[model samples]
Target chain A: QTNWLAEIVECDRVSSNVVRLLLQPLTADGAAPISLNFAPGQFVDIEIPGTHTRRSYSMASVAEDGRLEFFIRLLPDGAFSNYLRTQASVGQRVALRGPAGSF
Target chain B: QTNWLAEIVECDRVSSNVVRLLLQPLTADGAAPISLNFAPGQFVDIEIPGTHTRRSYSMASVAEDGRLEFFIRLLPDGAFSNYLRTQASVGQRVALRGPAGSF
Candidate 1:
């Protein structure tokens, strides 16, 4: 599992409880390109801001653009979901780990 | 800015990069109270788990109980300091918004 940072290039409120995000991983210095190689249906761990907690969200887009896409569901108890529902916006950055999961 | 989710319980690496976290905020289904009425030094906004980035850490143990403590600094362009310098532990959950700043 490689820990990395990604910037939110785009975000969409897919629905009332789900969101779509397009992320571009960045180097440790905010430089461009931190290629994350993953397969279809693979998921990564996301760190919920301000806390040491994490959640897994799979890639919804393909691995062709060096960018990652995700469709997240918001839940009353879902911390990440809450963040997406409320605070997430383009250009924001988030931490991630992996390219994990057997699916 | 409310978006919330916290778990971690405890985490400490205080050297080699600086880390020390202890969070506990549940209540969507994970049960436990979700008090989190911050004060003292106020600062939140973390959600770096997988993507849709966010980073901003504060509150180094205070506000009494309701549990929330943090001391992080790992830069390199950070990304929640590369997930607390290579993946954090302890119950693991993450995702937060405010308690904002001004302090």
Candidate 2:
């Protein structure tokens, strides 16, 4: 069942526990018709800028809303999270390719 | 977007390059309405019979039909693949939760 598609609408540092990201549907015509249904333990692979490494982040949100959210705990030298914390900005498009993991 | 759900419907040990497995929808009513979509490099987590470790298998089919297919190469002493080869049977239900990976 693969209908997961995403486009960045907003990315902001909310708190230490979360990074508020608003993703617009790139595949669906408007808002994604299917509700975002993911198990709590599931994860998605994020393509970080300037690195070939694709990092997998555990999804912290349930599958109800069309918008997806991730709570990324910033590591001391995490290549991807560090970029998101210090470099990624609002209204910028980041390539996303997942919601992958066995739920 | 998280709508990937799976239930084992068939498991056949086919050659060495592939393992034929059929999955039923455990979440959706009737046949799964959404077509199965996955990239070539994407993988899914599979629960083993007698172990806690989950193994990731790359998906071999594109998103067009409701059925999801996986081509798993059996490794020497690989925990999950070995079990699928020797112990898994048709009509036996196995837990599945995936289509998790960066597309």
Candidate 3:
């Protein structure tokens, strides 16, 4: 039931149609790092940029310094995928909620 | 990734607007029972009656003889809720997909 504003610290194309993103939770002022309590087998819901749509993705790496790693498959027709390829960049903030799902 | 045709074996009002349903998976002929492998904290996706829309609900009870239990809240504007109250009946079958969720 946690919600946070996370900034993209890293966004890199991992494959032809796959991208890896690293998110870092920030304090409200965006001046300090915050820790997120998460466990293995849990996932986060990411709000698609410019839309209310939320998509769930499993955590690809353990939480470190409240940072999260996600490997996204950029579907040809996916809105989120288009954003990742066209608009997403390092330092951009996104709404994130979780850690959700039951393992 | 299991898709099943399950019959509504029991449906009872558990609260003012909440109903509990028990589903028993059946073979293609609907003459025999089938076993479904599921685990705790898993959920199922139920296709709404007469529509392509699907909704997800958590399994409320353990799998017993491949029977699954679900508790649903009847939302006034929800198509699935309306169907549950007006059309769902014992022996009526529904399409269900599961055991989803990263529990």
Candidate 4:
């Protein structure tokens, strides 16, 4: 139930059609890092601001990491991927509501 | 990755938006009953053949039951609920997958 805003710290191309995302919390300049709590195989729901769409992607990085890494397969007609690749960049904030799912 | 075919034996109205679905394996004539195994909080994906749609429902009935039961919330704009209520019926065959989930 911990909903927070996260910024894309890094994005990497993993495969021909897959991209990896590393996200960290967006806090005040002097604020302590809010440790993200979630078990392995848990997923996060990313909400697109303009589009009424939320996409869930599983966490590829282990829980202990300070940031989260998500490996996403870019679909042919995916709006999420368009933003995740073209629009969302380092320091870009995304509304995140999760740590959901049980794999 | 185990996928199975199940038939709805009982579908009951639990609440205004919720319905309880009791399912059993659809076997050939004289086939022995194959027990449905799943964790307490696991979910199953039900596929409607011609609808090109699939929905996941958490297991409400314990694993000990000879059959499986799912408590589904009928949504106002949900295709799954439409299929679950208007289209799906007793003895209807739905492609069931998993025992999917850890919690």
Each candidate's clash count? 20, 6, 4, 0
Residue-wise C-alpha lDDT for candidate 4, range A1-103, written one tens digit per residue: 4586888888878677767688885556755545446443456678886666877665544434458767665756567878866787788788887775421
TM-score of each: 0.44, 0.41, 0.47, 0.47
Instruction: Give candidate 3 regions above 4 Å deviation.
Output: A1-103, B28-36
Report lDDT (Cα) of residue B54, candidate 2: 72
Candidate 1's docking class is: incorrect
| lDDT ranking, high to low | 3, 4, 1, 2
Candidate 1 C-alpha lDDT tens digits along B1-103: 3777878887777544556677875555554444446642345677877788875554544433457666564646556777777787787888888865321
List DockQ, one per candidate, in order.
0.02, 0.03, 0.04, 0.05
Estimate every model's Cα lDDT from 0 to 1. 0.65, 0.55, 0.70, 0.66
Give candidate 2's error at residue A10 in angstroms. 29
TM-score of 4: 0.47
Candidate 3, A1-103: lDDT as tens digits = 3897889998888744667788886765554434447543356778877789876654555455767767665767677888888889999899999875432
lDDT of 1: 0.65
For model 2, residues A1-103, the per-residue Cα lDDT tens digits are 4434466657766665446555543454564354454443345566765666666545444345555555554555668768877887655555555555432
Better of 1 and 2 by lDDT: 1
**Best candidate, lDDT:** 3
- B73 in model 1: Cα distance from truth in Å? 30
Per-residue alpha-carbon lDDT of model 4 for B33-100, expressed as tens digits? 45445543356678875866877665544434347766665756677878777877788888888865
Candidate 1: DockQ?
Answer: 0.02
